Structures are given as C-alpha cells and as structure tokens.
Design a protein around this ligand. Structure first.
Ligand code: HDE
Ligand code: HDE
Ligand code: HDD
Ligand SMILES: [S]
Ligand SMILES: [S]
Ligand SMILES: [S]
Lengths: 726, 726, 308, 83
C-alpha cells in the first residue's frame, strides 16, 4: 500500500470549509446528495477501488511501468498493444473548445418554483411548487480559451440546463441584461474583434487592444454593453455574487394560447459584489483558477450558490409602449418600469465527478425550449437559434451529442432519427419513418394542450418584404449607456472612467482612442472629459456641446443598475486572512474565530512558513499558507491578532499583505500590538473608518469588522489609496 | 394511417421458415433468446410502442408533417428548431466505411469448448466445457463498398468477437488459410491493386481488372491465395457453408509457461458449398443482398449457423521441421501433416436489432488477445497489430470506440485513461495516473499466473540486426499453389481454369495476361495450357519445359483442400422452388412438403402472378413470388408437381427457370405431366442422373431428390451444359 | 473610408523598436525577408485590399450588417445562405489543441552550417556551409492550454522544422537536457499527474498541486528534471535567452555507414537569462502573453533570435 | 461539416471558385488559405475596411434578395393548394 497508514490521503465525505481537506469528486465528497439527474448518471459512473488495472478491452495488465522490447535495453516492439492503446487514448484526449465561453465552471443543483405559474405559462417545470427540476449550470467568461484566467475583465455567461419532465430547457444567459450587437449576422465580426488578433494571437482574456476598440468606435450600438463591461460588473467577486439575465425578450404561452413577453432574471441570494481592477488583474496571475476554485469550495463547504429566478412580464398589447424596441437586445427594460416578479429558487449543491465528461462536454443552446415558452423576432436571438445546434457537430463529434450522459434528457425521448457517429441508442422500432403502418405509427405525434402536449409555435403575425434591413426603431445608441452611467454611485462611475482609460491606453493607434472618446461625449460629457484627461486628449468645442441623449421613458436613473447603491451584503462564505505570529494571544484568536463561525465566515491562518506555531497559552495553531502563498487578493478582510508582533513587524510580505488589502478597499482589523501595523498603511492615531482597532479582539471588535464585511469594501478609502506604494 | 386490424403487419415472435413472415429486429423476433452480452445491451435498447414522438431533447412534437413558415405558402423560418434538429441528424448519419471488408453481415451467438484445454492454454474461455462465452460474428467480402453485392468472387472475412471473463478476444479470420502477401508493408499496394482503379473508380467487387493482375504477375508470392480466389471457394453458397481460418501462426501459453504454435480453423457444421460462377455473377444483379438475407433468415428459421473451432498445434521445437516457414502467411499447414484438433462449437442464434448500431459500428482487431494467447513474428500479423487500432480513430470518431455498446467488454474494465471525443464513462477515481497514493494505487496491476492474471508476453528470444529484409525462407511461391491445384476434383480444376480465363479476358493490356500465364506455367503445365488456350495464347518451348515445383513435405495432394472431394453435405436449411400451376395435384404437394419438412428443407411456392391458386382439393396456396421474381439462382433444387401442366407448359419464365437451374447443376424433380418439361432441358426418355421423375411425388421420388441435394450439385451434368442456351 | 487621413493605421514596413508601431502579419511587416519556404507559401497567401467582400463561393455580398428577415422587425429566413455560411464557418473555427505544449509561439527563419559535416553525417542540410535551410520554430510551455499564461514555471518546448532538400527534419527539443521519466509507457501517467486534476480541472499552468508531487514522490527517476524545473530554468526571461536540447541520444550516419551517437544542443546567442519567481508569477497576471509578445516584437525590431 | 471534415470544404480544389473570394472568415479544420489582412472583422479602420461590401447593380454587384411580400401567421401548415 502507497496510501499513508493514518488515512490522511482521503478527504472527509462531509461538508468542510475551504482548505480543510483536499477537494474531491462530487459523488465521493457528498454521496448523500441526490436528484433525478444525478441518479440517472449512475449507469455510466466508473469506480476504481479494488479493481484490476486493464486495457479498454478488459484485459488485466501485469506491468504498467514498461514497454515491450527485445531485451531490456532493446527496441520497442510493434506488438505492444497495451502501450499503443494507452498512448492512442492519450493522443486523442482533446476535443475542440467552445468558440466562445471556452473557460467555464459548472455544478449540479435543483430548481423549484414558489407557486404554480399556470395562469401565464403551461411550462410543466413551473406548474407546481412541489415539482423539483434537476439543473446543471455552467458559468463562464467569453473571450479567453479553456485554459485562460478566471478574474479577467469580460462578460460572464450563466447557462442553466433544466431537466424537465417535458424536455430539456436551456436558459443560456449572461451577467448583463444586454449584448454588444443587434443582429446575429455580425456576431463573427464582433467576436473576431474582441478575440486575440489573428496575426499573433494576442491578447488572451482581454478587450484591451486595437481591434476591439476599433469595432466599438465604428459600431455605437456596442456602447451599452461596453459601459457594463467597463464597470466593476466586468470583474465579479464570485459566480455566487453576480446577476444573470436571459438577454432577450422570449414569450410565455399559457393553456388558453395567450402570449406574454418575458425577460429572465437571476438574482444572487448571496448579493452582488465585484473586485477592483488592480486586484482582479493581479489575481489572474496569483490564481488564474480563483472563480472555479471558489465555486467548487463553496459547494464542498455547504455555502451552496443560490439564485432566485425572476420574470419581467409585458403584455402583448404593450409591445410599443416604451421609448425603445422590446426586440432590441442592446436595450434593457428598466426595473423601475417593469418589475421583476419572483418565480422560484435554484440551489447548486453538488460538484461534478469528472470535469471533462460533465463540464467540457455539456452542450447548452437557447433553442432548447419546452411547451409554455416561445421565441420572438429579436434578430440576435433568431440567429443564435442556428448556431448552438450547428457548433456541436465539430465540438462534440456529431449529431448524437444528446446521448453524451450530461446532455441526456431525463424526460422520455423517441423518434425516427437513426445512426450518426457515436450512436449509443439501439432502436428496435421496425419503422424508421412516419407515417408507418408496420409499427402502428409509433412513436406518435401529440396534439398541443394544457399539459403533456406537443409543441406548437405561437401564431404570431408576420408581414413585410424579404429584406436585409435594420429596424429604424433600433437606431438609437446613447440613451441606455447614459441611464446606466447616471444610475451608478460616484465610486462606481470612477471605476468606469478608469476601465475605459486603462483599456484605451493599451490601444496602439491614437485615432482609435480619439474616436472612442468622441462616442463617450455623446453619452455623458463628464464621463468623456474624465476619460479624455487620462488619455491626454482635449475635447473640441463641438464635442463640448453635444446634446445629451434623452432619458428613457422619463427615468433619469434606475438604482437597480448599480452594484452597490442599494446594500445587499451577505457575509456567509466570505473569507478572512488571519496573520499569525510565533506567540499569538489565544484569547484574541478564540474571539475572532468564534464570531466568524457564528456568521459562516471562513478563515485562513497565515505565517512566514508552513507547519505550526504555538500560542501564549500552549495551543498549537496549524498554518494554512505563507503570506506570499495566499495573498490578500484571495480574501475579503484581514485580521491581525496580538502577541509577539516583533516577529512579523519587519517582514516585507506581512507588511505588503496589509498594504495590498488596504489599496483594494478591504476591511482590516488590528488588535493590541498589531496596531503597530498602522504605520505601514499610514493610519492616524485617532484611526479611520474601515480600520477596526482595539486593545483586544472583542467586546465590539468582531461586530465592527463583520459590519464592514457586510458592506463589502470601504469606498470612502478611495481618496487615500493613491498615496500608498502598493 | 395505421396497422391493419388483422395484426398482419407484425411477424410472429416464433421461428418461421424464410418468407413466411416479414423479418424483424432480433429482440422482437426472438425475445427469449438471451446471453450475457445481449442482456448487457438492454441499457441502450430503445422501444417505441405507446411513446410520444419527440425531439432528441425530449420535447413532444405536435406536427411532424410540416416546416414552420410565415403563412402556409411562405418562407421557412430559422426558428424551426424541430426541422433543423431532424434534418441535422439526417445530414450526419453516415460514418466512414471500413477500408477493407466494408460489406458484411453479422449476428449474435455463443461458444463453448468441448473440454478444458488447460494443458495447452490458460485462456479462461477455453478452460471449462460449461463456461459459455457470448460472441458477435461478422462475415464480409473484402474489396467492395458497404453497398456492393454479396455473391461476388472475392475472399470472405469471418471475424468473431468473444466476450470472455478475462477480456475481449477477437479472432479475425478469412475463408482461406493464407493471404496474398508476406509483409504488412505491402498491404496498401495489394489492396490498392485489387480495389477500383483510381482514375475512374471501376470495377466494384471484382479483381477482374488490369491493376490486380499486374500486381499478381509481378509478385508471385500472391499466387497461392489467387488460386483459392479463382476456385469456387471465391463464391460461397452461404456464410454457413464456408470454412474459416485465422490466417497466422499464433501461440497458446499454458499455466506452466509452455508455448505451442497454433493455427485456428472453423469447420462449418452445415458443410462446405459454393455457387458456380455464372450463377454467382447473375445473383449479384438479381439479389445483391443474397448472403445477408440468407444468414438473417436462417437464424429466424432456427437453422442456426454452427461452426466447430479447431486448432493445428505445433510444438515449439518443431518450428523448422517443415519445408515452408511457419511464419509465412502465404503458406498453409496441410492437415495431412498436422491434423485439426476439435476444440468447441459456436452457434449464431440471434440477429441484431439495428444494423448500423451493432453491425456497422462493431470494431474487431486481432491484437485483442487475452492471457493464454500470444503473437508470433509473422510479418503480416505484426503489421496488422498496428492497423486495427489506428483505423478506428477516423472510422469510429475517436479513442472511446470500446464504449460503443456492441464493442463493450462484459468483463470489468478500469484504468487511468480519460477524456477523448464522446466520452461516456464518468470516472470517479481521484487519481488519473499511477503510481498514486491518493487512491491507494487503484486500479492495480496484477501479476501473471494460472487464471485471472495480468498479461505478460511470452519471452521469445530475439537475435538479429535491424533490417528491412524478407526472410530467405519465404522465397518460394509455387509449391503451395500446386498442392492446392492437385487436391481439387477435376470439375473444381475446370472451374479454376474458367475463373482465371474469365478474369484475364477482362485485362485490357495483353502483356499482363501473358505474364500471368507464364506464372501459371511455374505451378502446373496442364493448368497453364488450359488458361492459355482460352486466351488464345500459346506456351513457348521454354515454358513447356519449366520443372514443376517440389511436393510439400512428400504430399501429392491433400483432399481437405477440396470443397467437395470428401462428402460433408447437410440439407437442413436449404431451399427448394416449387413451380405451381392453377390446379396443383394436392396429393403431390402433400408428399413433397412432408419429405422436405422431415429434413428441415424449406420451400418457396412460385407462380406466374402473385396472390393465390387453389389446388385440386380446394386447398388455397399463397404464392411467395413469381418465376421472374425469385429465380432459380436463389434456391438449391426445383420441383414441379403434377396437375394442370398446360397452364405453365408454354410459359417462357417457367421454362427458363428449369433451363437456368439445369445449367447451374441443380437437382430438378418432375412428377406426372410435369415430365413434359424434360423436353426443354433435353433429357432422354431413359432419364438422367440428376433429374428425378415419376408418375407422382412419393417416398421414393423425394428420397431420390433429397439424396441429390445432399451432394449439393450434379457435377456429372457438366459435359451436357455447354450446349444449353441459358 | 474608415482609415485615418494621415495613414497612421498602417505600421511602417521597416524594422521598428517595441511599441513604436502597431504589430503586423510578417509578410506585411517584412515583405522582402524571403527563404525557400516563405516563398513556396505564396500560392496560399491571401490579400484583401481592393477586393470585394464575398461568400466562400465567390458571391459578392451587398449588406454584411443584416440577416434576411420578413419585414425589418420580422423573423430571420432559412433562405439566408449568406448569414448561414458566415455563422457556420464561425461555429467550426476551433480544432483540438495539442495534448501537451498547447501554449506556444512560432516564427520563420533559416539555418546554415559553419562547415561541411560529411565526415560524420550524410545529412544533406549539414553538407556545405552554403546550404541555407528554411526553418519554422515553435517555442512552448508544456502543461497549460493554448490560452494559458507564458511566464509560468514549467519546462519549455523548442521545436524546429528544417525544410531540407532531402525531406523534413523535425528536431523536437525542450529547454532542459533530460526528461522526467524513462519509459514512454508512463507518459500519460506523468502528464495526467502534472495537468489540472480530473475532478475540477485545477490548476492551470502549474505543477504546484498534490497529484504532481504525489507522482514525483513515488517515482524518483523524475527528480532530475524536477530539479531543473524548480530552478530558475523553469522561468525563462525570453525564448531568446534559454538553451535547447534534443533530450535523446540519436545517431549520425556517414557515407561509409559509420554510426556516431549524438545529443543535440541549441546555444542562445543572446545569452542565458531567467526571471525570479515572484516576478514571473505576477507577470502571468499583468501580461499572460509576455513571451509571445517579446518574440514577435524582437523579430519586428531586427533583434532576431539566434541560436548555435 | 461531417462529409468533408469541416467548414473549409470550398478550399478542396474541385470546389474552389474561379471567381475571387475574400472575406473575414478564419480558421476551421484543414485551413489552407493564409490571410494577410490585419483585420478579421468589419467594419474596420485598420485595413481601410477591405474587403468591402458592393451595392447591387446590373453587373458585378452584391447579392440582394428579391423583396417578395410575406404575409401570414407563423404556422406549420401545408397550403390547401398543395392538397
Ligand atoms: C443572451 C446570453 C447570450 C447571448 C445574447 C449570446 N451568447 Fe452565445 N454562443 C454561441 C453563439 C452565439 C451567437 C450566434 C449569439 C448572438 C448571435 C450569441 N452567442 C450571443 C455559440 C458559438 O453557438 C456557443 C459557443 C459554444 C456553444 O455551444 O454555443 C455560445 C456559447 C454561449 C454560452 C456557453 C454555454 C456553456 O456551455 O457554458 C453562454 C452562456 C452563452 N453563449 C450566452 C449568450
Ligand atoms: C525531449 C523533447 C521532448 C521529449 C523527450 C518529449 N516531448 Fe513531446 N509530445 C508528444 C508526446 C510525447 C511522448 C510520447 C514523449 C515521451 C514518450 C514525449 N512527448 C516527451 C505528443 C503528444 O505526440 C505531442 C503533442 C502534440 C504533438 O504533435 O506531439 C508532443 C508535443 C511536443 C512539443 C511541441 C511541438 C510543437 O507542436 O510545437 C515539443 C517541443 C515536445 N513534445 C518535446 C518533447
Ligand atoms: C496491415 C494491414 C492489414 C493486413 C496485412 C490484414 N488486415 Fe484485415 N483489416 C485491416 C488491416 C489489415 C484493417 C484496415 O484495419 C481493417 C478494415 C478496417 C478495420 O477495422 O480493419 C481490416 C478488416 C478485416 C476484417 C473485417 C472485420 C470486420 O468484419 O469488421 C477481416 C475479416 C480481416 N481484416 C481479415 C484479415 C485476414 C484473414 C488477413 C490475413 C491474414 C488480414 N485481415 C490482413
Ligand atoms: S443578450
Ligand atoms: S492470413
Ligand atoms: S528528453
């Protein structure tokens, strides 16, 4: 036996906090979690304990350390089939990555509606509050490859596969309510522009280059989603703390045939939270896997990601009641005008077993709808319907991609389609065509109806000529960008200015920067001038006098568009760095950890080396990581307990730890002599808002720190950070 | 649009003679026929009765007759996801056909040994007479595409996948005991030479063209398997009536580590039987699916194909004791020198459910061996081991082809291979590498040993320099062709002469024909002269003086090489045509069918139209087919009962039916006034061996006919057929 | 016309230092840099200036901004073949990345011997100092995907395709003189152990995880190459400032048939230089394309990577 | 895409147009054409927007569909005129 005698190789099969145990496949970590979809994958799960090592043909291998050769220093022989099978499989491990959203992280879960929605839709999964629907959700960035970094500035995808009793429904959304372009025909142009440039394939995971900003400068329809991407929305803290949106108007269809327009929303029940740019960028270096890691670790800890599904609903007769076109996917519907109606809750509660088999191979497509839903003429959605079926033929090797286990419906599926590469189902039907008499015409068509009926499209009226023409109603580009900007807090506006300014500084051709500053001056002058100043660009008198675009249906702001205007903080599943010394004060540590535990906040004990230290009272403190090994980037707040401070007081890494966290607006707490660190971050003796300090870590020391963590970051600190060399 | 109320759309799920019922998928025709492998496929078998028609995503379809369009005469809309899924699946149905043996027909069955072979092999499937091993067997031609004809002149493949408790073993053999070439490196040259020529892709299913005969004339090593292809072995009556051979010397390894050389044989329990060329060629047009159909219908009838597995065993110390090299696959081991030892019986007792899923996707490969078996240095076999794994990467879409259901072992398989296109198995193992501690090194290597051990190669001594060189011992080409020639009956000899004559007459370049005839002069002068005469070629004096090659180890002949010299006929499963008239003498039909039924010989009732005729006693006789629609090519013998003979006496098709059957040497029986047809085939009053005749069909009449059928064809008639214009 | 009046969209076709001009495709940047291989690729190069936008079938497109729909707010029509061809080609852009060394950056160049080596090898490309052999060289990391970061700690690949008059010779080497393992049968074990772990596909571009060190601790043959990787060898400053090695003993064979054992080396004429760990790791965040960019810009500047 | 291995089937020699073809499509399996365009998107300024759209006209013009009137509901229905 190679495993250690004390069994320390095997992670505990129970919820444990991040860093406590090695991570493990989901069915080994959490064997007791189940749902209908996880149960149905059992037929393809493969174990390993107590089994012999074999070829794929089931032949036992005796020596898996050597090739067959003529003498032990001789040539390898062609008859070594065990070598060539093993090397052949290795040689062909890779499949094409997704064209877009190639980088993504996924988990199993379940959804349940709060009440029956049968008055507005006949969709079975929404018909009964007792009906529980397994899901599989993959979150992703858009631009970078499958081996790119998580905390880039980019749009995020938020795709949910609902395994309903009436078919697969895939809700394939993003973490913003709009898209960059209006018509699908342009999608390869936009994507080529944001992707790495074709001569040298640079830059990865970044829109900060010439071709992206060239396209944007020439296509003002893009500016609304660009605003979102340049805001802190483009750098979420966690997949658990971002919004999701369905992007398009779809329809709900009830049993009476009535169509209602719908846009889909996901509300994060952990609240909304994003990083800051310097932190996000550096984190792509310190842990390019941070969001994938955070997701997996949250689920293993029992901090299950939870989201509320919501609908914005618009009666058909209200189609033209707004200043913008409901079909224009560059336009959002302000929640001030049409509120989000809560629909149900989704909980993600199990990681996969094998990332390639379940995550890399999952195929999501927004044309996968079920009776009770339908499309609209959104011309971006229209073109999507073509793409998501098409792309699977190369990505997943052919048209039987629904037979890959993760993609399989749990609902019955029977039809007359046959063959194709990788065909798994063995059809016993004497007929492969209908109508047929030789199998009495089974499987048979089903009329539409209130429940369990066939799909029939809503009989929308179509009238006009065959044209390649943009609707005039889509020809307005600035008013939504403006509403967005006006809805942001002053610190959020500052970060938008800095996003544009940083990205445009990386554009090599100056005229492209100038062209984009011209577009900004059509949205808001203050924005445009602030960006211009950072670029050394002076606005013309003409630019200074551009009339701002009109408000959107009387609105001059909508606070729902801000990450932070309206507090929705939740500290459960957040993490604190605790900076240890060789003689910690145990009573500080006891009080710190007791209060953190009570709110479901994790801790990591950091020091200048691995191993343990011992507190004043003899308690042995295990070390999780070194200061360098687990940088402040990775945590939400830092606490320094009292004790032998002299031990770490001249440690570059320890000092820098507090400077980095300080710069990135994180709460800091210093107890007793740890207050000696106030000098490294230039804190006055009377103290400042956002730095907790006291003789000891309690009475109200932890409550103060926890209040600051509920507000996420210390925005008031922003004027003080420019001074700090960090 | 439904089934007839009488239920006549659905075949009885009981054994039924050919033509009595429509054929059906095996699980529906014979639902109680089971074996371990058939059962294991239940996870993927898909029914149809009582199920709703759906998309592949499980969405019920309301209207499977129409595309979604804007008005009922309008353009089709891109949002029709039901249309596009259905058409996309259809657009991608085809996968690449096999490079060779693309045309093939397959069935399920089982094997068991007669006695334990543990003294010579530790192979588990040969260890116990009561351990049953499921098999799946595919029979094939070689040259033609998957849609080419069955009864071509070609070698046949005979591939058997044994699903053993210690892994899959594929015995991938042919119907002749040698191959055309010596070294795998030449395989693409030979195959390209026999295949359709590259400019115009002609001819299909035929070696009768310049490139094949060019290669043969230049590579005399091919002459032995050419002799076999030109003989009637090239045109089998049925896959049930040909021999199988494993082509190479392999090794058996027992528990004590002793190696014995072995060559594999399959003996058809239905006996050895072939067509004649004119019949074979015409049958490729009248029924290009004759051997596929006959195989399927034999199994539906309960005439299960049975074969006996046999081994030629040579001790290791006898490697060099013959006057040919045991490792030369152009050389056979005469059964006079080394007898076939009977080993066990294989029965094919169920057809597949879906030909594409089970037949087209099956992957056989002779490197798939199991402990107890091993290879040799045969240079043809050596290279085959590279090819059968490599080719599946394109044909079957990647390295997970063992997960396609027909290919899966029934034995456990566990290893550290991961990913690849359309990966089914979801591995839970924390480890994907070994050695590992994190899963205590499972799955683990297993030492070799007497049973359930790891594979280890037999420790054969290798001594030589790295060379591309043919063994001098392989450089003899004429003795085995001569042995084969001399072992044939005189009518078999004539048919060989005729096959070379017919083929070479289609070679356009006359010098190629001349060069082949020169090769024939090195084998046997009588053969060479007989071919030359048909090509209008005259042997030179030198050619006339070529010394015949030596006998093979003293043998002048070996009768086991002939199809017919030793009687081994079995009539069960054969078929007779019964030519009706509009008032059949029911007393004749009664005695005919009674006698046929007693020997398991089937009948097809033929007439000049379809529908029914009524016999003299009121019996209503349904007609299987017209004289033209089921020609005498498709049957073994023809019987004409008495009755209203005037009805058919001047029918051109009925007369021709007898002329064609006569020409092709088939038994014919004529009762009562049907003796009037003796005039069409010029039989004298006295009668003729091979024509049964009497006042009525009785005991004696049927015994005589059945005796003729047990001898397959009436070879003594050959002198009489030159003259018949048919 | 969308280009600026002053023509500042287009980089000068002359050597320029890093950051002075936008970077460009090699045949536009350096039109007059030629070798037999570069010239032979002319049959497939495709330009763009002054040509009409078409489908792949040669049909001129009038409107590349819209789908064909029934009315300007209507549904998209199945008969829009222009849209479908464009979206199809997009949908199928990607091909599988390399199993290992998926991350890599390449350039064209040439090789010339210093003297005839006919006494030791009959290889034609080594037969005369006048023999100029075109090359295409790809440098790579090993572990990370095609979109992973350049300045990780890893072994680097250094692969050279020599287009000789007697066939392609590929010298497929790395930046250390050995490998981790002894027998090819174990390559999928070692590579699975260093790659992202199978349950969750973490970590990218890093050996710093349990399975790699588990395998290393159980397979001491690995320890030599592990030493190189843990050294600053694992974090080169530039593909220009690292050594290359053939990894194996090969043979040279001369005209008499005499065999000589050989191991191959590439010596960087810009000298040996590596980053320090903190700087490398932070650089994966600040510029994950740093080595790819550095190589492209050195060649644009005339700082041609040279190796002996 | 399965039969001919991908979206570059127009570059298989028999399939190639003899007319010029230029566009912003890139990559795919078996890619033969080596595109020198600085741009792989339009509109672009970096290559002066080439290759460029072409208005329809009497000769050598861009493709534009005939502006046929469409009128009706979204239906899966066979026209009665076909019965
Ligand atoms: C609204 C949310 C959204 C929008 C508006 C779009 N994407 Fe996505 N996308 C594909 C193509 C495509 C097109 C043609 C359009 C507008 C025309 C969009 N996108 C905008 C795709 C190339 O077909 C795609 C790549 C892989 C795949 O299977 O489909 C694709 C991916 C994708 C994902 C990834 C889902 C996953 O596997 O995790 C998500 C969340 C979106 N798109 C959202 C989306
Ligand atoms: C010493 C230089 C070296 C060594 C010793 C090895 N690699 Fe490499 N490698 C492939 C397989 C492979 C095996 C089986 C072994 C030992 C048995 C090595 N490697 C060690 C590969 C999977 O066949 C590979 C992946 C893509 C491909 O085409 O081949 C492969 C890549 C590779 C490259 C990249 C060349 C390029 O595409 O730019 C380099 C430089 C090495 N290997 C070096 C190498
Ligand atoms: C080195 C190349 C090579 C050579 C020398 C041989 N084969 Fe082979 N054979 C192949 C390479 C191949 C193949 C190209 O790999 C095929 C077609 C595709 C497949 O899976 O295997 C194949 C198929 C194939 C099949 C069809 C199995 C099926 O039904 O799917 C049979 C029966 C044989 N072969 C039999 C033979 C015999 C009796 C040989 C003489 C001893 C022989 N092959 C030599
Ligand atoms: S969207
Ligand atoms: S053979
Ligand atoms: S190596």
């Amino acid at each position: 036996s190679l495993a250690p005698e004390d069994g320390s190789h095997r992670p505990a099969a129970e919820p444990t906090p991040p860093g406590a145990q090695p991570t493990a496949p989901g069915s080994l970590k959490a064997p007791d979690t189940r749902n209908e979809k996880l149960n149905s994958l059992e037929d393809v799960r493969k174990g390993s304990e107590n089994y012999a090592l074999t070829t794929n043909q089931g032949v036992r291998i005796a020596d898996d350390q050597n090739s067959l050769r003529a003498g032990s220093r001789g040539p390898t022989l062609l008859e070594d089939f065990i070598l060539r099978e093993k090397i052949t499989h290795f040689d062909h491990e890779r499949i094409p990555e997704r064209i877009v959203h190639a980088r993504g992280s996924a988990a199993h879960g379940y959804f349940q509606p709060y009440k029956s929605l049968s008055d507005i839709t006949k969709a079975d999964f929404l018909s009964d509050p007792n009906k529980i629907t397994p899901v599989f959700v993959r979150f992703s960035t858009v631009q970078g490859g499958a081996g790119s970094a998580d905390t880039v500035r980019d749009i995020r995808g938020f795709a949910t596969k609902f395994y309903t009793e009436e078919g697969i429904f895939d809700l394939v959304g993003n973490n913003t309510p709009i898209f960059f372009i209006q018509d699908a025909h342009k999608f390869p142009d936009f994507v080529h522009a944001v992707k790495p440039e074709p001569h040298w394939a640079i830059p990865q995971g970044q829109s900060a280059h010439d071709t992206f900003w060239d396209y944007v400068s020439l296509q003002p329809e893009t500016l609304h989603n660009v605003m979102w991407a340049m805001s802190d929305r483009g750098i979420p803290r966690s997949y658990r703390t971002m919004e999701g949106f369905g992007c398009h108007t779809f329809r709900l269809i009830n049993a009476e045939g009535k169509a209602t327009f719908v846009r889909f929303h996901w509300k994060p029940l952990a609240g909304k939270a994003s990083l800051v740019w310097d932190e996000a960028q550096k984190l792509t270096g310190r842990d390019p896997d941070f969001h994938r890691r955070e997701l997996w670790e949250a689920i293993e800890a029992g901090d299950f990601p939870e989201y509320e599904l919501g609908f914005q609903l618009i009666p058909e007769e209200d189609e033209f009641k707004f200043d913008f076109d409901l079909l224009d996917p560059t336009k959002l519907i302000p929640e001030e005008l049409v509120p989000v109606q809560r629909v149900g809750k989704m909980v993600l509660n199990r990681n996969p077993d094998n990332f390639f088999a379940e995550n890399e191979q999952a195929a999501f497509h927004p044309g996968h709808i079920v009776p009770g839903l339908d499309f609209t003429n959104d011309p971006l959605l229209q073109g999507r319907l073509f793409s998501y079926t098409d792309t699977q033929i190369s990505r997943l090797g052919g048209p039987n991609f629904h037979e890959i286990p993760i993609n399989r419906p749990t609902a019955p599926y029977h039809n007359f389609q046959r063959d194709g590469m990788h065909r798994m189902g063995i059809d016993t039907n004497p007929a492969n065509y209908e109508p047929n008499s030789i199998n009495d015409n089974w499987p048979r068509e089903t009329p539409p109806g209130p429940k369990r009926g066939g799909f029939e499209s809503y009989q929308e009226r179509v009238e006009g000529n065959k044209v390649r023409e943009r609707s005039p109603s889509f020809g307005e580009y600035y008013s939504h960008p403006r509403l967005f900007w006006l809805s942001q807090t002053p610190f959020e506006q500052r970060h938008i200015v800095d996003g544009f300014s940083f990205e445009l500084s990386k554009v090599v051709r100056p005229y492209i920067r100038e062209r984009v500053v011209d577009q900004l001056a059509h949205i808001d002058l203050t924005l445009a001038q602030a960006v211009a100043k950072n670029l050394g660009i002076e606005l013309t008198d003409d630019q200074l006098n551009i009339t701002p675009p009109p408000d959107v249906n009387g609105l001059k702001k909508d606070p729902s568009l801000s990450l932070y205007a309206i507090p929705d903080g939740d500290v459960k599943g957040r993490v604190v760095a605790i900076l240890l010394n060789d003689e910690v004060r145990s009573a500080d540590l006891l009080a710190i950890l007791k209060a953190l535990k009570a709110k479901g906040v994790h801790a990591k004990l950091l020091y200048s080396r691995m191993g343990e230290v011992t507190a004043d009272d003899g308690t042995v403190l295990p070390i999780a990581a070194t200061f360098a090994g687990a940088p402040s980037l990775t945590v939400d707040a830092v606490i320094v307990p009292a004790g032998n401070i002299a031990d770490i007081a001249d440690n570059g890494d320890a000092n820098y730890y507090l400077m980095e966290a300080y710069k990135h607006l994180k709460p800091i707490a210093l107890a007793g002599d740890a207050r000696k660190f106030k000098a490294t971050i230039k804190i006055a003796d009377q103290g400042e808002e956002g730095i907790v300090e006291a003789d000891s870590a309690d009475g109200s020391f932890m409550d103060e720190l926890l209040t600051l963590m509920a507000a996420h970051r210390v925005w008031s600190r922003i004027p003080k950070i420019d001074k700090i060399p960090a």
